[model samples]
Target: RPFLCTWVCCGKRFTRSDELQRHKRTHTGEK
Candidate 1:
């Protein structure tokens, strides 16, 4: 199953939790 992201601006979906976390960094400006 795919994990859908709806936290920030874009709702980019991912296959893994780690991928979602990394995607969130784009909005959070995390390294």
Candidate 2:
């Protein structure tokens, strides 16, 4: 699956969609 953003900072290779969604928030400055 394609990620919403081009950048991925997680050191882990495996991630869930929900995790990705949550991770994206960090990039957007979401609490």
Candidate 3:
């Protein structure tokens, strides 16, 4: 299994937790 981003309107799956973590910030507009 992979890290899944279950964020609203963004169901992005990532191979690494770091990748998912980084991606999640995009949705939140974090720098």
Candidate 4:
């Protein structure tokens, strides 16, 4: 998951589903 942008982009495995989507707030939008 070194280059997994959607689920592994964070480079960290989460214990909850929300934890995965929680990061969306940071850069879910496009330029």
Candidate 5:
């Protein structure tokens, strides 16, 4: 399975949705 995220500045791919959600912060520099 694969999860592609486009919510953040960069388009990143993850194996899980939860992973993508947290990864979003990295792109936005949010805490």
Candidate 6:
């Protein structure tokens, strides 16, 4: 089985790898 995780930011949910990667930048001061 593969492990999965979710990232929540600004009341939105991100479940995919690329989506989470992009979402992280919003919090990291990256554009």
Model 5: ten consecutive residues of lowest lDDT: 22-31
RMSD of each: 2.2, 4.2, 1.9, 5.7, 2.9, 4.8
lDDT of each: 0.82, 0.59, 0.86, 0.52, 0.76, 0.54
Q: For residue 17, give model 6's deviation from the true position in Å.
A: 0.9
lDDT of 3: 0.86
Q: What tens-digit string does per-residue lDDT give for candidate 2 at 1-31?
A: 5444456555433246776677777667575
User: 1-31 in candidate 3: lDDT tens per residue?
Assistant: 5899998868889999889988988877576
How many angstroms is residue 9 displaced in model 1 relative to the true structure, after the best TM-score fit?
4.3
TM-score of 2: 0.40
Which run of 10 residues does model 1 get worst, by summed lDDT? 22-31
Error of 1 at 11 (Å): 1.4
Candidate 4: give the clashing pairs: 4-9
The Cα error of candidate 3 at residue 29, in Å, is: 7.3
Judge candidate 6 at residue 5 and give its lDDT.
35
Quote each prediction's TM-score.
Answer: 0.63, 0.40, 0.70, 0.39, 0.47, 0.40
Which segments of model 5 are wrong by more than 4 Å?
Answer: 27-31
Which digits, one per residue and each the tens of the lDDT, describe model 4 over residues 1-31?
Answer: 2222363445655566565556555666432
Candidate maximizing TM-score: 3
Candidate 2 lDDT (Cα, 0 to 1):
0.59
**Candidate 6 per-residue lDDT over residues 1-31, each given as its tens digit:** 2223333435555557676667667666375
Ranking by lDDT: 3, 1, 5, 2, 6, 4
